[PDB]
């Protein structure tokens, strides 16, 4: 198989970078601040313009002290170490990274089309062919990531950006981890957690395949398979072993989803002897040309409205706050390898 060999060469390049990560590849003054694109508890994402090239980028700025307070040191180090080492068509690229007295900076490619989340909510739901086009890209991305011993752990429409060709660009490697055995961290988004995560069990890459079932259901239905007003209520629905499907779902889609949203780990698609091939060879994907999807040769169902290289209409507005850089170095030892 040429997929097996593509993956062999992809692991060769990844391991060299994983072992000798790039550090300090730019500095703040090389960038001009334009607008806040997003905010989080320990950081924010800014639209910025690179002075030397005129290129626009999405600069993620993390407050080191807030990362330390939230016990996300190791997760942040994983995120940067992984991002600088990976290379795949459906992943947002890390262009530069650096740190100063106060913050960590990850300069990513800017995807002006916004999150799938906004388009999905506005439209209501995607047709089966539209959902299939997006899902196929996640299938190939997880096959790529998992082959590098990486678990992604944060699949959701909020983390899937739509590029100018209408293809997905996966963002947020905050929970990504290189692990060969099982792992135990309680992390992810309530609607998307596999039962083994909720039940505090050791888990592996099968949680990403469960999250794919949640994503495909949400794209095709317009709502998640398990939802409620509070997370505990969502968890009780996830572990119950029951899923209801809208009447408009095709028999092939329901069959695929029963195999992905499988509470039993020995029966979950992507986790069996055939691995990812049980998904790729499923009836719902019969129409999918996996190589054409990878090559970006398939016509996209939706092309976002292009109104300039640095336009921001596909993103909400946020209060424009100061980027403070202290005169004293904060948390130096904790982020030494960043």
């Amino acid at each position: 198989e040429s997929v097996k060999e593509f993956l062999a060469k992809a692991k060769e390049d990844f391991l060299k970078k994983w072992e000798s990560p790039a550090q300090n590849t730019a500095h703040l003054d090389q960038f001009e601040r334009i607008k806040t694109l997003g905010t989080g508890s320990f950081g924010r994402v800014m639209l910025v313009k690179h002075k030397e090239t005129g290129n626009h980028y999405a600069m993620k700025i993390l407050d080191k002290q807030k990362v330390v307070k939230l016990k996300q040191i190791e997760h942040t180090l994983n995120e940067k170490r992984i991002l600088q080492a990976v290379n795949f068509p459906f992943l947002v690229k890390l262009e530069f990274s650096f740190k100063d007295n106060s913050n960590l900076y990850m300069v990513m490619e800017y995807v002006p089309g916004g999150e799938m989340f906004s388009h999905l909510r506005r439209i209501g739901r995607f047709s089966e062919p539209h959902a299939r086009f997006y899902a196929a890209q996640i299938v190939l991305t997880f096959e790529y990531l998992h082959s590098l011993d990486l678990i992604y752990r944060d699949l959701k429409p909020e983390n899937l950006l739509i590029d100018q060709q209408g293809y997905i660009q996966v963002t947020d490697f905050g929970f990504a981890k290189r692990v060969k055995g099982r792992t135990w961290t309680l992390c992810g988004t309530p609607e998307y957690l596999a039962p083994e995560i909720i039940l505090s069990k050791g888990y592996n890459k099968a949680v990403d395949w469960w999250a794919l079932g949640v994503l495909i259901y949400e794209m095709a239905a317009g709502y998640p398979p398990f939802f409620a007003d509070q997370p505990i209520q969502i968890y009780e629905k996830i572990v119950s072993g029951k899923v209801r499907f809208p009447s408009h779902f095709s028999s092939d889609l329901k069959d695929l989803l029963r195999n992905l949203l499988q509470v039993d780990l020995t029966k979950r698609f992507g986790n069996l002897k055939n691995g990812v091939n049980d998904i790729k060879n499923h009836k719902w994907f019969a129409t999918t040309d996996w190589i054409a999807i990878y090559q970006r040769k398939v016509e996209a169902p939706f092309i976002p409205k292009f109104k300039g290289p640095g336009d921001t209409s596909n993103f909400d507005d946020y209060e424009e706050e100061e980027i403070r850089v202290s005169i004293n170095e904060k948390c130096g030892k904790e982020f030494s390898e960043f």
């Binding site: 905050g174 992390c187 992810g188 988004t189 309530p190 317009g222 709502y223 409620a228």
Partner: peptide, 20 residues
């Protein structure tokens, strides 16, 4: 309808991750 019940819920906006 299930759609109506979702739209009237408090979880139709961008969903935050759990850390703990």
């Amino acid at each position: 309808t299930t759609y109506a019940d979702f739209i009237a819920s408090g979880r139709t906006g961008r969903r935050n991750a759990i850390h703990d």
